[PDB]
Coordinates of C-alpha atoms and ligand atoms in Angstrom, one line a residue:
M1 CA 20.5 -7.8 22.0
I2 CA 17.5 -7.0 24.2
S3 CA 17.3 -9.2 27.2
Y4 CA 14.7 -9.9 29.9
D5 CA 16.3 -7.0 31.9
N6 CA 15.0 -4.3 29.6
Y7 CA 11.3 -4.5 30.1
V8 CA 9.0 -5.6 32.9
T9 CA 6.5 -8.5 32.6
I10 CA 3.4 -7.5 34.6
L11 CA 1.9 -10.6 36.2
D12 CA -0.2 -9.0 39.0
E13 CA -3.0 -6.5 39.3
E14 CA -1.2 -4.3 41.8
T15 CA 1.6 -3.7 39.3
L16 CA -0.9 -3.2 36.5
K17 CA -2.7 -0.6 38.5
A18 CA 0.6 1.1 39.3
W19 CA 1.2 1.4 35.6
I20 CA -2.3 2.6 34.7
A21 CA -1.8 5.4 37.2
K22 CA 1.5 6.5 35.4
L23 CA -0.2 6.1 32.0
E24 CA -3.0 8.4 33.1
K25 CA -0.7 11.3 33.7
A26 CA 1.7 10.8 30.7
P27 CA 1.4 13.4 27.9
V28 CA 1.2 10.6 25.3
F29 CA 1.9 6.9 25.5
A30 CA 2.7 4.1 23.1
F31 CA 0.3 1.1 23.1
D32 CA 0.3 -2.2 21.3
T33 CA -1.7 -5.5 21.2
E34 CA -0.5 -9.1 20.6
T35 CA -2.9 -11.8 19.2
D36 CA -3.1 -15.4 18.0
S37 CA -3.9 -14.4 14.4
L38 CA -3.5 -11.8 11.6
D39 CA -7.2 -12.2 11.0
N40 CA -8.8 -9.2 12.9
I41 CA -12.3 -10.5 13.2
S42 CA -11.4 -13.9 14.6
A43 CA -8.1 -13.2 16.4
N44 CA -7.9 -13.5 20.2
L45 CA -6.0 -11.0 22.3
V46 CA -3.0 -12.7 23.9
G47 CA -1.4 -9.7 25.5
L48 CA -0.8 -5.9 25.6
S49 CA 2.3 -3.7 25.8
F50 CA 2.7 0.0 26.8
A51 CA 5.6 2.6 26.8
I52 CA 5.5 5.8 28.9
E53 CA 9.0 7.0 28.1
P54 CA 11.9 5.9 25.9
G55 CA 13.2 2.8 27.6
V56 CA 10.4 2.4 30.0
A57 CA 7.9 -0.2 28.6
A58 CA 6.0 -3.2 29.9
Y59 CA 4.2 -6.4 28.6
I60 CA 1.0 -7.7 30.2
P61 CA 0.4 -11.4 29.1
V62 CA -3.2 -12.4 29.5
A63 CA -3.7 -15.5 27.3
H64 CA -0.5 -17.6 27.0
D65 CA -1.5 -21.2 27.3
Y66 CA 1.5 -23.4 26.6
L67 CA 2.2 -26.3 28.9
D68 CA 2.9 -25.0 32.4
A69 CA 2.6 -21.3 31.5
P70 CA 2.8 -19.2 34.7
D71 CA -0.3 -17.5 36.2
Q72 CA -1.3 -14.3 34.4
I73 CA -3.9 -11.6 34.9
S74 CA -7.0 -12.9 33.1
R75 CA -8.0 -11.3 29.8
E76 CA -11.3 -10.1 31.3
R77 CA -9.7 -8.6 34.4
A78 CA -7.0 -6.8 32.5
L79 CA -9.4 -5.3 30.0
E80 CA -11.9 -4.0 32.6
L81 CA -9.1 -2.3 34.5
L82 CA -7.6 -0.9 31.2
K83 CA -11.0 -0.1 29.6
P84 CA -11.4 3.4 31.1
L85 CA -8.0 4.6 29.9
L86 CA -8.4 3.1 26.4
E87 CA -11.9 4.6 25.9
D88 CA -10.7 8.1 27.1
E89 CA -10.5 10.5 24.2
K90 CA -8.3 12.7 26.4
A91 CA -5.7 9.9 26.9
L92 CA -3.6 10.2 23.8
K93 CA -2.2 7.0 22.2
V94 CA 0.7 6.4 19.8
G95 CA 1.0 3.2 17.8
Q96 CA 2.2 1.4 14.6
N97 CA -0.9 0.6 12.5
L98 CA -3.5 1.5 15.1
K99 CA -6.2 0.3 12.7
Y100 CA -5.4 -3.2 13.7
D101 CA -5.3 -2.5 17.5
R102 CA -8.6 -0.6 17.4
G103 CA -10.3 -3.7 15.8
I104 CA -8.9 -6.2 18.3
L105 CA -10.3 -4.2 21.2
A106 CA -13.6 -3.9 19.4
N107 CA -13.8 -7.7 19.7
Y108 CA -14.3 -7.2 23.5
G109 CA -16.8 -4.3 23.4
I110 CA -14.1 -1.6 23.8
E111 CA -14.0 1.6 21.8
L112 CA -10.4 2.8 21.5
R113 CA -10.4 6.6 21.5
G114 CA -7.5 9.1 21.6
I115 CA -6.1 7.5 18.4
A116 CA -3.8 10.5 18.0
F117 CA -0.6 9.3 16.4
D118 CA 0.2 6.4 14.1
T119 CA 3.9 6.1 13.3
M120 CA 3.1 4.3 10.0
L121 CA 1.2 7.3 8.9
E122 CA 3.7 9.8 10.3
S123 CA 6.3 8.2 8.1
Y124 CA 3.9 8.1 5.1
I125 CA 3.0 11.8 5.2
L126 CA 6.6 12.8 5.7
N127 CA 7.6 11.1 2.4
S128 CA 5.4 8.4 0.9
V129 CA 8.3 7.2 -1.3
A130 CA 11.1 7.2 1.3
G131 CA 10.8 3.5 1.6
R132 CA 8.7 0.9 3.5
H133 CA 6.6 2.3 6.4
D134 CA 6.6 -0.8 8.6
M135 CA 8.1 -0.7 12.0
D136 CA 11.2 -2.7 11.2
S137 CA 12.1 -0.5 8.3
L138 CA 11.3 2.6 10.3
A139 CA 13.4 1.7 13.3
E140 CA 16.4 1.1 11.0
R141 CA 15.9 4.3 9.0
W142 CA 15.3 6.7 11.9
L143 CA 16.9 5.0 14.9
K144 CA 19.7 2.8 13.4
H145 CA 18.1 0.1 15.5
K146 CA 17.3 -3.5 14.3
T147 CA 14.0 -4.7 15.9
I148 CA 13.2 -8.3 17.0
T149 CA 11.3 -9.9 14.1
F150 CA 8.2 -12.0 14.6
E151 CA 10.0 -14.9 12.9
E152 CA 12.7 -14.6 15.6
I153 CA 10.3 -15.5 18.4
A154 CA 7.7 -17.6 16.5
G155 CA 9.6 -19.4 13.9
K156 CA 8.9 -19.9 10.1
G157 CA 6.8 -22.2 7.9
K158 CA 3.8 -24.2 8.9
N159 CA 5.4 -25.2 12.2
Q160 CA 5.4 -21.5 13.2
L161 CA 4.1 -20.8 16.7
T162 CA 1.1 -18.5 17.5
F163 CA 1.7 -15.8 20.2
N164 CA -0.1 -17.7 22.9
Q165 CA 2.5 -20.5 22.6
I166 CA 5.6 -18.3 23.1
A167 CA 7.2 -18.1 26.5
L168 CA 6.2 -15.1 28.6
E169 CA 9.6 -13.4 28.7
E170 CA 10.3 -14.0 25.0
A171 CA 6.9 -12.6 24.1
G172 CA 7.7 -9.7 26.4
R173 CA 11.0 -8.7 24.7
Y174 CA 9.2 -8.5 21.4
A175 CA 6.0 -6.8 22.5
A176 CA 7.6 -4.2 24.9
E177 CA 10.2 -3.3 22.3
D178 CA 7.4 -2.6 19.8
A179 CA 5.8 -0.2 22.2
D180 CA 9.2 1.4 23.1
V181 CA 10.4 1.8 19.5
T182 CA 7.1 3.2 18.4
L183 CA 7.3 5.9 21.1
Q184 CA 10.9 6.7 20.0
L185 CA 9.9 6.9 16.3
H186 CA 7.0 9.3 17.2
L187 CA 9.4 11.5 19.2
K188 CA 11.7 11.8 16.2
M189 CA 9.0 12.2 13.5
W190 CA 6.3 14.3 15.2
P191 CA 8.7 17.3 15.5
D192 CA 9.6 17.0 11.8
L193 CA 6.0 16.8 10.7
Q194 CA 5.6 20.4 11.8
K195 CA 8.2 22.1 9.7
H196 CA 5.3 22.3 7.1
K197 CA 1.6 23.1 7.5
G198 CA 0.7 21.2 4.3
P199 CA 1.7 17.6 5.4
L200 CA 0.7 18.4 9.0
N201 CA -2.8 19.3 7.8
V202 CA -3.2 16.0 5.8
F203 CA -1.9 13.9 8.7
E204 CA -4.1 15.6 11.3
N205 CA -7.4 16.0 9.5
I206 CA -7.3 13.3 6.8
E207 CA -5.1 10.4 7.7
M208 CA -5.5 10.1 11.5
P209 CA -9.3 10.4 11.6
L210 CA -9.5 7.8 8.8
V211 CA -7.8 5.1 11.0
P212 CA -10.9 4.0 12.9
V213 CA -13.2 4.3 9.8
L214 CA -11.0 1.9 7.8
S215 CA -11.2 -0.5 10.8
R216 CA -15.0 -0.3 10.7
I217 CA -15.2 -0.9 7.0
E218 CA -12.8 -3.8 7.1
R219 CA -14.6 -5.4 10.0
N220 CA -18.0 -4.9 8.4
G221 CA -16.9 -7.0 5.4
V222 CA -19.0 -7.6 2.3
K223 CA -21.7 -10.2 1.5
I224 CA -20.6 -12.6 -1.3
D225 CA -22.8 -15.2 -2.9
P226 CA -20.6 -18.3 -3.3
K227 CA -23.3 -20.2 -5.4
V228 CA -23.3 -17.4 -8.0
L229 CA -19.5 -17.5 -8.1
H230 CA -19.5 -21.3 -8.5
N231 CA -22.0 -21.2 -11.4
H232 CA -19.8 -18.5 -13.1
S233 CA -16.8 -20.9 -12.6
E234 CA -18.5 -23.9 -14.2
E235 CA -19.7 -21.8 -17.1
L236 CA -16.2 -20.3 -17.6
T237 CA -14.8 -23.8 -17.8
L238 CA -17.2 -24.6 -20.6
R239 CA -16.5 -21.3 -22.4
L240 CA -12.7 -21.9 -22.1
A241 CA -13.2 -25.3 -23.7
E242 CA -15.4 -23.9 -26.5
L243 CA -12.9 -21.1 -27.2
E244 CA -10.0 -23.5 -27.4
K245 CA -11.9 -25.5 -30.0
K246 CA -12.8 -22.4 -32.0
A247 CA -9.0 -21.7 -32.1
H248 CA -8.1 -25.2 -33.3
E249 CA -10.9 -25.1 -35.8
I250 CA -9.7 -21.8 -37.3
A251 CA -6.3 -23.2 -38.0
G252 CA -5.2 -26.9 -37.6
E253 CA -3.9 -29.3 -34.9
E254 CA -3.6 -28.4 -31.2
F255 CA -1.6 -25.7 -29.4
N256 CA -1.4 -23.6 -26.3
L257 CA -2.7 -20.1 -26.3
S258 CA 0.8 -18.8 -25.5
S259 CA 2.4 -16.2 -27.8
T260 CA 6.1 -16.1 -28.9
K261 CA 5.7 -19.9 -29.0
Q262 CA 2.6 -21.4 -30.6
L263 CA 0.9 -18.2 -31.9
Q264 CA 3.6 -16.7 -34.2
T265 CA 3.8 -20.2 -35.8
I266 CA 0.2 -19.9 -36.8
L267 CA -0.8 -16.2 -37.0
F268 CA 1.9 -14.7 -39.3
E269 CA 2.6 -18.1 -40.9
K270 CA -0.9 -17.7 -42.4
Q271 CA -0.4 -14.0 -43.3
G272 CA 0.2 -11.1 -40.9
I273 CA 3.3 -9.2 -39.7
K274 CA 6.0 -11.0 -37.7
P275 CA 6.1 -9.3 -34.2
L276 CA 4.0 -10.6 -31.2
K277 CA 1.9 -8.9 -28.5
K278 CA 3.1 -8.7 -24.9
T279 CA 0.5 -9.7 -22.2
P280 CA 4.4 -2.4 -23.3
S281 CA 1.0 -4.0 -23.4
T282 CA -1.3 -1.0 -22.8
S283 CA 0.4 0.7 -25.8
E284 CA 1.1 -1.9 -28.5
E285 CA -1.4 -4.8 -28.5
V286 CA -0.9 -6.5 -31.9
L287 CA -3.5 -9.1 -31.2
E288 CA -6.4 -6.6 -30.8
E289 CA -5.5 -4.7 -34.0
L290 CA -5.9 -7.9 -36.0
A291 CA -9.2 -8.4 -34.0
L292 CA -11.0 -5.8 -36.1
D293 CA -11.0 -8.2 -39.1
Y294 CA -9.0 -11.4 -38.2
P295 CA -10.9 -14.0 -36.2
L296 CA -8.1 -16.1 -34.5
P297 CA -6.3 -13.3 -32.5
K298 CA -9.7 -12.2 -31.3
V299 CA -10.6 -15.6 -29.8
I300 CA -7.1 -15.9 -28.2
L301 CA -7.5 -12.4 -26.8
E302 CA -10.8 -13.3 -25.1
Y303 CA -9.6 -16.8 -24.0
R304 CA -6.6 -15.4 -21.9
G305 CA -8.8 -12.7 -20.3
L306 CA -11.4 -15.2 -19.1
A307 CA -8.7 -17.5 -17.9
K308 CA -7.1 -14.8 -15.8
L309 CA -10.5 -13.7 -14.3
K310 CA -11.5 -17.2 -13.3
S311 CA -8.5 -18.1 -11.1
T312 CA -8.3 -14.6 -9.6
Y313 CA -11.8 -14.0 -8.6
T314 CA -14.2 -16.8 -9.5
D315 CA -12.0 -19.5 -7.8
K316 CA -10.5 -17.3 -5.0
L317 CA -13.4 -15.1 -3.7
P318 CA -15.4 -18.1 -2.2
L319 CA -12.4 -19.2 -0.3
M320 CA -12.1 -15.8 1.4
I321 CA -15.4 -15.9 3.2
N322 CA -14.8 -15.8 6.9
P323 CA -16.5 -18.6 8.8
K324 CA -17.1 -16.4 11.8
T325 CA -19.1 -13.6 10.0
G326 CA -20.0 -15.3 6.7
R327 CA -18.5 -12.3 4.9
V328 CA -15.4 -11.3 3.0
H329 CA -13.1 -8.8 4.8
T330 CA -10.7 -7.1 2.4
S331 CA -7.5 -5.4 3.5
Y332 CA -7.2 -1.7 2.8
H333 CA -3.6 -0.3 2.8
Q334 CA -3.4 3.4 4.0
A335 CA 0.4 3.8 3.5
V336 CA 1.4 2.2 0.2
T337 CA 0.6 4.3 -2.8
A338 CA 2.9 7.2 -3.9
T339 CA 0.0 9.6 -4.6
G340 CA -2.0 8.9 -1.4
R341 CA -4.8 6.8 -2.7
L342 CA -6.0 3.7 -0.7
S343 CA -5.1 0.4 -2.2
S344 CA -6.7 -3.0 -1.5
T345 CA -5.8 -6.7 -1.4
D346 CA -7.5 -10.1 -0.6
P347 CA -9.4 -9.2 -2.7
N348 CA -8.0 -6.4 -4.7
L349 CA -11.3 -4.7 -5.6
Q350 CA -9.6 -2.4 -8.0
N351 CA -8.5 -5.1 -10.5
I352 CA -12.1 -6.3 -11.2
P353 CA -12.8 -5.1 -14.8
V354 CA -15.1 -2.2 -15.1
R355 CA -15.9 -1.9 -18.8
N356 CA -16.1 -5.6 -19.5
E357 CA -19.1 -7.9 -19.2
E358 CA -17.5 -10.6 -17.0
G359 CA -16.3 -8.0 -14.5
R360 CA -20.0 -7.2 -14.2
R361 CA -20.8 -10.7 -13.2
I362 CA -18.2 -10.7 -10.5
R363 CA -19.9 -7.6 -9.1
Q364 CA -23.3 -9.4 -9.2
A365 CA -21.9 -11.7 -6.6
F366 CA -21.6 -8.8 -4.1
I367 CA -25.0 -8.9 -2.6
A368 CA -27.1 -7.1 0.0
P369 CA -28.5 -9.1 2.9
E370 CA -32.3 -9.6 3.3
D371 CA -34.4 -6.4 3.5
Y372 CA -31.3 -4.4 2.5
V373 CA -30.0 -3.0 -0.8
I374 CA -26.5 -2.1 -2.2
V375 CA -26.0 1.6 -2.6
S376 CA -23.2 3.1 -4.8
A377 CA -22.1 6.8 -4.4
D378 CA -19.5 7.8 -7.1
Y379 CA -17.6 11.1 -7.8
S380 CA -18.2 11.6 -11.6
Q381 CA -14.8 12.1 -13.3
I382 CA -13.3 13.8 -10.2
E383 CA -9.7 13.9 -11.6
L384 CA -11.0 15.8 -14.7
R385 CA -12.9 18.3 -12.5
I386 CA -9.7 18.7 -10.4
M387 CA -7.7 19.4 -13.5
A388 CA -10.3 22.0 -14.6
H389 CA -9.8 23.7 -11.3
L390 CA -6.0 23.5 -11.2
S391 CA -5.7 24.9 -14.8
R392 CA -8.3 27.7 -14.0
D393 CA -9.7 27.1 -17.5
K394 CA -13.0 28.9 -18.0
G395 CA -13.8 26.6 -20.9
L396 CA -13.6 23.4 -18.9
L397 CA -15.1 25.0 -15.8
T398 CA -18.1 26.2 -17.8
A399 CA -18.6 22.7 -19.4
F400 CA -18.9 21.1 -16.0
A401 CA -20.9 24.2 -14.7
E402 CA -23.7 23.7 -17.2
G403 CA -23.8 19.9 -16.9
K404 CA -22.5 19.2 -20.3
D405 CA -20.5 16.0 -21.2
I406 CA -16.9 17.2 -21.0
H407 CA -15.7 14.8 -23.7
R408 CA -18.2 16.0 -26.3
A409 CA -17.7 19.6 -25.1
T410 CA -14.0 19.2 -25.6
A411 CA -14.5 17.6 -29.0
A412 CA -16.8 20.5 -30.0
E413 CA -14.0 22.9 -29.2
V414 CA -11.0 21.0 -30.5
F415 CA -12.7 20.0 -33.8
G416 CA -14.9 23.1 -34.0
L417 CA -18.4 22.0 -34.5
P418 CA -21.8 22.1 -32.6
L419 CA -22.2 20.0 -29.5
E420 CA -25.2 18.2 -30.8
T421 CA -23.4 17.0 -33.9
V422 CA -20.2 15.7 -32.3
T423 CA -19.7 12.1 -33.5
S424 CA -18.6 9.0 -31.4
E425 CA -15.2 8.9 -33.0
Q426 CA -14.6 12.6 -32.2
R427 CA -15.8 12.2 -28.6
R428 CA -13.6 9.1 -28.3
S429 CA -10.7 11.2 -29.6
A430 CA -11.2 14.1 -27.1
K431 CA -11.7 11.6 -24.3
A432 CA -8.3 10.0 -25.0
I433 CA -6.7 13.5 -24.9
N434 CA -8.4 14.4 -21.6
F435 CA -7.3 11.3 -19.7
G436 CA -3.9 11.5 -21.5
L437 CA -3.2 14.9 -19.9
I438 CA -3.8 13.6 -16.4
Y439 CA -1.1 10.9 -16.8
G440 CA 1.1 13.4 -18.7
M441 CA 0.9 11.2 -21.8
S442 CA 3.2 12.0 -24.7
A443 CA 1.8 13.0 -28.1
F444 CA 3.0 9.7 -29.5
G445 CA 1.5 7.7 -26.7
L446 CA -1.9 9.3 -27.6
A447 CA -1.4 8.1 -31.1
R448 CA -0.9 4.5 -29.8
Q449 CA -4.2 4.7 -27.9
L450 CA -6.1 6.4 -30.7
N451 CA -4.5 4.3 -33.6
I452 CA -3.9 7.5 -35.6
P453 CA -0.4 8.4 -36.9
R454 CA 2.1 10.5 -35.0
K455 CA 2.0 14.3 -35.6
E456 CA -1.7 13.8 -36.4
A457 CA -2.0 13.2 -32.6
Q458 CA 0.3 16.2 -32.2
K459 CA -2.2 18.1 -34.4
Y460 CA -5.0 17.4 -31.9
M461 CA -3.0 18.3 -28.8
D462 CA -1.9 21.7 -30.3
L463 CA -5.5 22.4 -31.1
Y464 CA -6.4 21.4 -27.6
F465 CA -3.8 23.7 -25.9
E466 CA -4.9 26.6 -28.1
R467 CA -8.5 26.2 -27.1
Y468 CA -7.7 25.3 -23.4
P469 CA -4.5 27.4 -22.7
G470 CA -4.9 27.1 -19.0
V471 CA -4.1 23.4 -19.2
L472 CA -0.7 24.0 -20.9
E473 CA 0.1 26.6 -18.2
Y474 CA -0.7 24.2 -15.3
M475 CA 1.4 21.6 -17.0
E476 CA 4.4 23.9 -17.4
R477 CA 4.0 25.5 -13.9
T478 CA 3.9 22.1 -12.2
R479 CA 7.0 20.8 -14.0
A480 CA 8.6 24.1 -12.9
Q481 CA 8.1 23.8 -9.1
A482 CA 8.8 20.1 -9.3
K483 CA 12.4 20.9 -10.4
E484 CA 12.6 24.0 -8.1
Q485 CA 11.7 22.1 -4.9
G486 CA 11.9 18.4 -5.7
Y487 CA 8.2 17.8 -5.0
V488 CA 4.6 18.6 -5.9
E489 CA 1.5 19.0 -3.7
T490 CA -2.2 18.4 -3.6
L491 CA -4.9 21.0 -2.7
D492 CA -4.7 19.8 0.9
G493 CA -0.9 19.9 1.1
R494 CA -0.1 16.2 0.6
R495 CA 3.4 15.9 -1.1
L496 CA 4.9 13.5 -3.6
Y497 CA 8.7 13.7 -3.7
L498 CA 10.3 13.4 -7.1
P499 CA 14.0 12.4 -6.7
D500 CA 14.5 11.7 -10.5
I501 CA 13.2 15.2 -11.6
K502 CA 16.8 16.3 -12.4
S503 CA 18.0 12.7 -12.8
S504 CA 20.3 13.3 -15.8
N505 CA 18.9 10.0 -17.0
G506 CA 16.5 10.4 -19.9
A507 CA 13.6 8.0 -19.4
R508 CA 14.0 8.0 -15.6
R509 CA 13.5 11.8 -15.6
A510 CA 10.6 11.5 -18.0
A511 CA 8.8 9.3 -15.5
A512 CA 9.4 11.9 -12.8
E513 CA 7.9 14.6 -14.9
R514 CA 4.8 12.6 -15.7
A515 CA 4.4 11.9 -12.0
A516 CA 4.8 15.7 -11.5
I517 CA 1.7 16.5 -13.6
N518 CA -0.3 13.5 -12.4
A519 CA 0.2 13.3 -8.6
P520 CA -1.5 16.7 -7.9
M521 CA -4.8 15.5 -9.5
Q522 CA -4.7 11.9 -8.2
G523 CA -3.6 12.9 -4.7
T524 CA -6.4 15.5 -4.6
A525 CA -8.9 12.9 -5.6
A526 CA -7.6 10.7 -2.9
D527 CA -7.8 13.5 -0.3
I528 CA -11.4 14.2 -1.3
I529 CA -12.4 10.6 -1.0
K530 CA -10.9 10.3 2.4
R531 CA -12.6 13.4 3.7
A532 CA -16.0 12.0 2.4
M533 CA -15.3 8.7 4.2
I534 CA -14.7 10.6 7.5
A535 CA -17.7 12.8 7.0
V536 CA -20.0 9.9 6.2
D537 CA -18.6 7.7 9.0
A538 CA -19.1 10.6 11.5
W539 CA -22.8 10.8 10.5
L540 CA -23.1 7.0 10.8
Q541 CA -21.7 6.9 14.3
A542 CA -23.7 9.9 15.5
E543 CA -27.1 9.2 14.0
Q544 CA -27.0 5.4 13.8
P545 CA -29.1 4.9 10.7
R546 CA -29.7 1.4 9.1
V547 CA -26.6 1.6 6.9
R548 CA -23.1 0.2 6.8
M549 CA -20.2 1.5 4.6
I550 CA -18.8 -1.7 3.0
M551 CA -16.3 -0.7 0.3
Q552 CA -14.1 1.9 -1.2
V553 CA -12.9 1.3 -4.8
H554 CA -11.6 4.0 -7.2
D555 CA -13.8 7.0 -6.7
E556 CA -16.9 5.3 -5.2
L557 CA -18.1 4.4 -1.7
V558 CA -20.4 1.3 -1.4
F559 CA -23.0 0.9 1.3
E560 CA -25.7 -1.5 2.5
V561 CA -28.9 0.4 3.2
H562 CA -32.2 -0.8 4.5
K563 CA -34.8 -1.0 1.7
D564 CA -37.3 1.2 3.5
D565 CA -34.7 3.9 4.1
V566 CA -33.0 4.2 0.7
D567 CA -34.5 7.6 -0.3
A568 CA -33.7 9.6 2.8
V569 CA -30.3 8.0 3.1
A570 CA -29.4 8.6 -0.5
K571 CA -30.1 12.3 -0.2
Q572 CA -27.9 12.3 2.9
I573 CA -24.9 10.4 1.5
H574 CA -25.1 12.7 -1.5
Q575 CA -25.0 15.9 0.5
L576 CA -22.2 14.7 2.7
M577 CA -20.0 13.7 -0.3
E578 CA -20.3 16.8 -2.5
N579 CA -20.9 19.5 0.2
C580 CA -18.9 18.4 3.2
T581 CA -15.5 18.0 1.6
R582 CA -13.7 20.6 -0.5
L583 CA -15.8 23.6 -1.6
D584 CA -13.4 24.7 -4.4
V585 CA -13.5 21.9 -6.9
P586 CA -16.9 21.5 -8.8
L587 CA -17.9 18.1 -7.5
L588 CA -20.7 15.8 -8.7
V589 CA -21.8 12.6 -6.9
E590 CA -23.9 9.9 -8.8
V591 CA -25.8 7.7 -6.4
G592 CA -27.4 4.4 -7.4
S593 CA -28.9 1.2 -5.9
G594 CA -29.9 -2.4 -6.5
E595 CA -29.9 -6.0 -5.3
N596 CA -26.1 -6.3 -5.9
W597 CA -23.1 -4.2 -6.5
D598 CA -23.5 -4.5 -10.3
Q599 CA -27.1 -3.2 -10.1
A600 CA -26.1 -0.1 -8.0
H601 CA -22.9 0.5 -10.1
Ligands
MG1 MG1 -10.2 18.9 -21.5
MN2 MN1 1.1 -3.9 16.6
ZN3 ZN1 3.5 -5.9 18.8
ZN4 ZN1 -10.8 7.7 -10.8
ZN5 ZN1 -26.1 17.6 -5.5

């Protein structure tokens, strides 16, 4: 176990000051905060823990208020004595998910500096796919130590206690162990993170500096109009009713809009071909093939889609508005994706349909406050530009260089015809090839996206590789080093380990080869986006203009800018994004604005 003998519980100023003195001369120190809620903006700090050396850690309770809780240093007195140390950029701190801790302190007017090491990110940069990067998983992987779980001291279910309700000593065991373990994890991982300059570079200049900027974006939140979302909800109810009637009217009787049950009994029973369509799906959608002529499958297609969107965003979004700020605070995850891109939840901004009309209405609900406007800064087809650079292809490089539409430029080369005459179908064919290459799509998978026969798709890809030889080379070379060293890297050095590259399993090894071609372009896009965020945030902090960075979704950064400042600010965001990141890839940033996210998008 871990008893009350392990760590000290600081209940007096004199002892706290003794520790602050030791903390001041430590080379690095682990630090952690305890609160009464996972919600950063409204959580209250219940206590703090520190670790100066493996096995030497302490817990300082400041707001435990259960019946008869012992005297504790007051939250205000503890923070004023600790403030200088916390705000000192020279005092280096180590922590697990420091983004959270930085925010809690910000609730009390404290600016946490010296945010040097985050064990979550150390683990993530070492090997993004090694497993989960949370402390409990980390302590077990690297230290063969099983940590005290929050459930162990607080309980489970609705009757679960909040930190302020837990006994001082019990809270101490948990909090001081976090600090201690975090320091031990750093001592084991930091030395390893130096065996390679690639990962070390990404960790030091991309991931760590991004920690406080993610905190600031999350805490800023985004303005959502609940009325608009409600109208959209009422209207969708009516549209779902109408659509259901249109389905019944086309055939007979009533039925659910569920395939492999009520649909096959209608659809193919009235002429068609037996198999159904899985909601596997992004490759063989039987329902949308029939949709080009057959009416029923087209209405069932649209019905399901609207049903999904209503319960996911229309009904959910209004419930996420924080009472304290009046805004929605999404959760960004910095150590979850395999390629290094940021993910998002509650809400998952990336699942809002882009090329769909309803998704546009969801976006219209993201509004700018009075006298402000929503500004969108996007990296135009960054992955494609990255592939152009990685393949060193003069053809692609020149297309982007002279500002031509790469999809029409590619079609003009593949099909051999003037750029002005390329048709929509030809452009659509080249476009499917271009994005297919990024995901390492098979010549048959391209046929399923283009609806053309196999070997006809193969005919296009051979014509493509002949016109753009540099792309085949990159593809072959990347699969090469992937087998030679078990991993692939981005331009900045970020690595994706591929354990199934020599799998001996067929499909399992195919996946690893696709990931081999894909990761370098996706990871590089990710690195670029993170560098722009740090650069834009740095300008924001230094110059203090009337602008907030509110979102990050796909390849765009969304802001709130004062209406009278839009022009100067747009010039600035634009320069920072395509000139203060990587100077090797030919980058283009498209900046737009409006009353809501949809207008600026
Ligand atoms: Mg191309
Ligand atoms: Mn913590
Ligand atoms: Zn903790
Ligand atoms: Zn993208
Ligand atoms: Zn420019």
